[PDB]
Design a binder for this molecule. Structure first.
Ligand code: HEM
Ligand code: HEM
Ligand code: HEM
Ligand code: HEM
Lengths: 146, 139, 139, 146
């Protein structure tokens, strides 16, 4: 990913402050509420009818934590994104059949959730760097669809 | 938009209050930095941080959103002037309305974290998509 | 849609005539082969070439399009039943409506090459986007 | 691009029959008519107000021929798409600032124009292979945006 050396340091320093469970649970829940067709993939998780049931569903929280942990792996391996997510790309293409447009949607919801948690510390410049990161991850996850 | 959406959008915008112009300017800045292709529509602007042109244009954007929130039942009528501008004169690629919408939501999250609940995010997303559709309706 | 679009769409569909079901089936087949992710919505179908389920479903799709062309001034009313089905029950990802639209245009090009002029392509594209919007309107 | 050996041969055999000037002129013209915001990039070419002026504009025809010729280069180099289009990706990102969503739009218009020219010979299976080709090209052209 085209990221300067000052940019990477700011990205890594913010990740130190990311609670993967809180952020991850909130980002996956907001995806399910805002883009409700994504609920189709998670029928396993039970009741996802109203926002209250989504945000407090323990499986939404646990899965969001797993998603965010894997995001954090990408953040710590920005020079090898395609290889970090190769196995996950196969899983999402071949087993789950997620359209890759949804990877971009989740990445943008994550950015909005980072904004909500960090406030004015989440500057326009730091958002810009995170937009490059989430796009890099979405394209690594789409690699094996191609 | 549903009636519940309308209620959430009117409620959420009353919490924005008089900061609509400032949020519109910040959203533009976030968009120009995150999505540099959008800068090509503004050759005549100083896109510096704190530029008065961006601040002034952010005020026009925030005012149009406030107008839209007062006319949720007839957005095409309330925004028809802006539809002609963005589609016929400016020919803005429709993808850029998604980018500005995302940057505006990001700005609202920053400044109104306790009010930017999942249900309010979902209603504002629908509102911004509905505005965007109107503004790209002339093609 | 503009009045010129409506005129083009009604004209173009009168040339489709009774082949709407056959074109709808071919469009589905083109979609399943070109865009294999779409097959996950049809676990209960034989997706074989010449499958009678695809042929029957293509007929339902073509009939709904013909109904829409007769109700261009009130698509949300004429299609409300289908909006609930695709958004609430089936939860079809909105991206797939773009894929089917493209496959339908491809099918019309194959069979009506002299009628599929640039102006008619542009009006049909707008018609199919307008149908798609209605069918994804319940979210 | 994930293409079988039988698939590549069918793709190449159709390209033998492609008139780059006719197909290219029609595909670029249809892009400009159907997606009219794309006209913004081609003010150089003059009158693009109505469909008749677009389809008969000689610069639209000449440019469409150039675009299609470069497509044909991709078709003949399907194992090295990223390298065939590297220089063009730089040009479209850095000099022209074309959003890459428009590469996908042009690729799909090209497929519709192939369908119109070849009729029943443009089978569902041959379209499917061309969809893989045009997506591979669109992603090679987007390479240096990332
Ligand atoms: C874009 C960033 C994404 C990342 C980093 C990511 C990551 C992951 C990870 C790490 C797993 C764990 C699989 C395992 O434990 O073996 C997983 C599974 C899964 N993901 Fe994703 N994912 C992303 C996007 C998406 C999206 C957008 C959807 C659907 C809208 C989705 C649907 C699923 C499903 C259904 C599973 C399996 C859940 C289960 O086994 O119960 N993912 N993903
Ligand atoms: C919520 C979406 C948007 C709204 C409410 C909005 C609103 C407005 C308003 C109120 C004006 C000025 C009208 C006037 O002074 O006559 C304007 C102008 C303009 N907009 Fe938009 N806009 C939106 C999206 C966009 C986007 C996405 C772009 C391009 C990336 C864009 C580019 C422009 C440009 C170039 C101008 C002319 C500015 C000038 O020359 O001073 N707009 N818009
Ligand atoms: C122009 C766009 C479309 C139209 C006019 C349309 C129309 C229809 C109609 C008329 C029905 C059957 C209603 C009934 O028998 O009760 C139906 C069902 C269905 N559609 Fe759509 N459809 C469109 C797009 C799509 C897309 C893009 C998908 C998914 C890729 C999809 C998936 C389904 C499925 C799974 C069913 C149920 C089929 C069955 O269970 O027999 N549809 N659609
Ligand atoms: C997706 C497949 C595409 C291919 C293979 C392609 C290829 C080309 C080629 C070969 C050139 C020649 C530049 C030169 O002669 O040095 C060019 C220039 C150009 N392209 Fe593309 N292009 C594609 C898509 C697009 C799209 C979608 C747009 C805009 C909507 C666009 C806008 C332009 C412009 C404005 C120029 C410069 C024209 C001039 O110098 O007069 N291209 N492209």
């Amino acid at each position: 990913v085209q990221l300067s050396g000052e940019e990477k340091a700011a990205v890594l320093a913010l990740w130190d402050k990311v609670n993967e469970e809180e952020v991850g649970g909130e980002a996956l829940g907001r995806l399910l509420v805002v883009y409700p067709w994504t609920q189709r993939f998670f029928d396993s998780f039970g009741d996802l009818s109203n926002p209250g049931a989504v945000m407090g569903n323990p499986k939404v929280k646990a899965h969001g934590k797993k998603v965010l942990h894997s995001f954090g792996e990408g953040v710590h391996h920005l020079d090898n994104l395609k290889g970090t997510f190769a196995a996950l790309s196969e899983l999402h293409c071949d087993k789950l059949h997620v359209d890759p447009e949804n990877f971009r949607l989740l990445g943008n919801v994550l950015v909005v959730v980072l904004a909500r948690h960090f406030g004015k510390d989440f500057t326009p410049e730091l958002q810009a760097s995170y937009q490059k990161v989430v796009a890099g991850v979405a394209n690594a996850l789409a690699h094996k669809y191609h | 938009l549903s009636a519940a959406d309308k209620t959430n959008v009117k409620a959420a915008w009353s919490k924005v209050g008089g900061h609509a112009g400032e949020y519109g300017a910040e959203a533009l800045e976030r968009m120009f930095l995150g999505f540099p292709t959008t800068k090509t529509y503004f050759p005549h602007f100083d896109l510096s941080h704190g530029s008065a042109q961006v601040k002034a244009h952010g005020k026009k954007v925030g005012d149009a959103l406030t107008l839209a929130v007062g006319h949720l039942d007839d957005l095409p009528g309330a925004l028809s002037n802006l539809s002609d501008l963005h589609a016929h004169k400016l020919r803005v690629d429709p993808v850029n309305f998604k980018l500005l919408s995302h940057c505006l939501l990001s700005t609202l999250a920053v400044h109104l974290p306790n009010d930017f609940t999942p249900a309010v995010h979902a209603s504002l997303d629908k509102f911004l998509s509905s505005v965007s559709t109107v503004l790209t309706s002339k093609y």
